[PDB]
Amino acid sequence: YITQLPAGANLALMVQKVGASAPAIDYHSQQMALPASTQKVITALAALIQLGPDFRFTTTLETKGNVENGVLKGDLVARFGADPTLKRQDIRNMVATLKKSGVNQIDGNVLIDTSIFASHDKAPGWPWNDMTQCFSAPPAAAIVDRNCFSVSLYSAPKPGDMAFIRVASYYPVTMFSQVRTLPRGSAEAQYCELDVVPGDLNRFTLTGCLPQRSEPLPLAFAVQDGASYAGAILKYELKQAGITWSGTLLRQTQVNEPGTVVASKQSAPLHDLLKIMLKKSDNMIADTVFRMIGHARFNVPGTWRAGSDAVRQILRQQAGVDIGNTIIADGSGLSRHNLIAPATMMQVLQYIAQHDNELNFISMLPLAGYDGSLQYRAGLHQAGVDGKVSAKTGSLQGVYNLAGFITTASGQRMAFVQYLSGYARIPLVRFESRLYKDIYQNN
Numbered sequence: 001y002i003t004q005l006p007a008g009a010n011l012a013l014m015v016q017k018v019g020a021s022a023p024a025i026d027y028h029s030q031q032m033a034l035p036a037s038t039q040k041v042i043t044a045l046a047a048l049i050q051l052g053p054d055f056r057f058t059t060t061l062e063t064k065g066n067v068e069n070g071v072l073k074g075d076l077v078a079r080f081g082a083d084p085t086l087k088r089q090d091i092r093n094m095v096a097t098l099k100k101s102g103v104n105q106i107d108g109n110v111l112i113d114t115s116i117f118a119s120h121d122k123a124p125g126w127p128w129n130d131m132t133q134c135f136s137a138p139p140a141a142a143i144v145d146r147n148c149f150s151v152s153l154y155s156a157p158k159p160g161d162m163a164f165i166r167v168a169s170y171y172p173v174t175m176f177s178q179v180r181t182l183p184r185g186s187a188e189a190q191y192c193e194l195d196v197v198p199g200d201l202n203r204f205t206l207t208g209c210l211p212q213r214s215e216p217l218p219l220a221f222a223v224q225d226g227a228s229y230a231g232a233i234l235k236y237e238l239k240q241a242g243i244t245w246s247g248t249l250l251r252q253t254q255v256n257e258p259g260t261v262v263a264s265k266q267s268a269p270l271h272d273l274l275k276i277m278l279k280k281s282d283n284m285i286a287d288t289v290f291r292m293i294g295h296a297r298f299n300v301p302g303t304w305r306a307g308s309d310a311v312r313q314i315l316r317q318q319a320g321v322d323i324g325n326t327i328i329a330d331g332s333g334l335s336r337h338n339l340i341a342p343a344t345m346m347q348v349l350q351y352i353a354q355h356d357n358e359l360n361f362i363s364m365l366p367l368a369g370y371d372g373s374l375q376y377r378a379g380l381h382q383a384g385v386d387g388k389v390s391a392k393t394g395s396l397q398g399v400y401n402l403a404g405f406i407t408t409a410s411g412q413r414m415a416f417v418q419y420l421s422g423y424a425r426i427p428l429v430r431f432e433s434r435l436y437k438d439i440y441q442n443n
């Protein structure tokens with residue numbers, strides 16, 4: 001049909017009027033595919049059902065013990081809550097509030113409490129090589145400024161001398177350079193890589209080669225140990241506010257009764273965060289939300305497995321969607337383990353459309369011609385459907401997925417799932433132009 005794009009590519013496609021019993025287009029709709037960021041559609045629905053639009057992430061400073069003459073006889077607890085939007089200034093402000101409450105001194109330990117979550121901060125099936133990139137920063141219980149920092153790498157004046165790293169003193173990381181500066185001619189330039197090697201306690205070593213360059217190379221990396229990073233920031237703010245402590249910084253991972261909350265920060269409401277997540281394909285909001293869903297549903301520390309089980313259960317029991325053999329490994333779609341058929345994603349989209357007056361969901365999706373990842377998508381623009389499609393992209397090396405809704409020329413809303421992979425821009429554009437033009441004009 002319209003099928004003629006590259007032969008190496010795999011298309012599974014389903015298009016169906018909202019509320020109809022049969023699809024208008026059905027091409028290999030039962031075939032399971034990698035959803036990439038369209039996984040976020042499922043995460044958003046399950047989140048709204050389990051947590052509600054008004055859920056907020058919460059971070060607190062708590063005291064366990066008596067305060068005598070400005071001395072806490074006991075521990076300060078910083079209880080992190082996986083808030084993906086927490087900033088350095090929020091820590092500073094909670095510390096200011098702690099001081100204001102009359103605590104000048106802690107005769108005890110400072111505990112960094114991450115007990116909200118347990119097990120690894122990285123989902124099964126995430127590629128190891130992207131773990132130092134900010135887009136794949138481990139979505140830990142302890143996040144400050146997205147657990148991303150930047151660094152400037154300078155080549156040495158003398159070839160053979162070590163390239164050197166500048167980093168802002170406000171990042172509690174430890175950088176080492178083993179990078180050799182190459183002369184502009186070097187035979188080494190072709191196959192000598194420039195690499196980052198993370199170590200314990202937020203140490204990073206840069207290795208390999210860098211050709212002489214006139215300006216520094218800017219680099220941004222993901223924090224691997226969020227609890228230590230957040231601890232170091234808290235320790236700095238305590239010291240600056242003149243609060244001393246006699247113990248040490250310790251991680252608290254086991255569930256425990258809360259102390260007296262002396263300071264707190266709540267995120268924006270979940271509906272607002274889910275909107276950012278869908279409009280910008282924000283992996284960190286997606287994946288903090290995902291482990292939070294499991295924690296909320298089962299009253300256990302949030303893990304990837306509990307998140308997966310909970311989302312499956314929510315879809316089946318609340319949304320009437322049995323996802324069968326679907327694999328849900330995370331919230332963002334980062335995992336190469338995620339596997340779902342258009343027919344299953346369609347049941348999710350139909351539920352959303354049928355309940356949209358309740359969920360206010362469709363307004364959160366990128367709107368073609370306006371925003372999100374659809375501000376300008378050549379295929380949709382050329383199909384004449386700007387303003388008519390609200391959809392989530394899933395875009396990877398060779399993957400061009402779209403999942404969402406289109407209003408046709410006759411005013412009917414059709415749901416659609418386009419799972420297209422192994423693509424290797426003209427052919428995609430020609431395919432989407434034709435396909436969406438057809439859907440819009442002929443329905």
Ligand SMILES: *C(=O)[C@H]([C@H](C)O)[C@@H]1N=C(C(=O)O)[C@H]([C@H]2CCCO2)S1
Pocket residue numbers: 036037038135281283332333334373393394395396
């Ligand atoms: C969704 O398909 C992916 C996630 C990571 O699986 C997200 N969306 C993209 C995009 O191209 O829209 C993201 C880009 C931003 C920088 C590199 O990844 S990740």
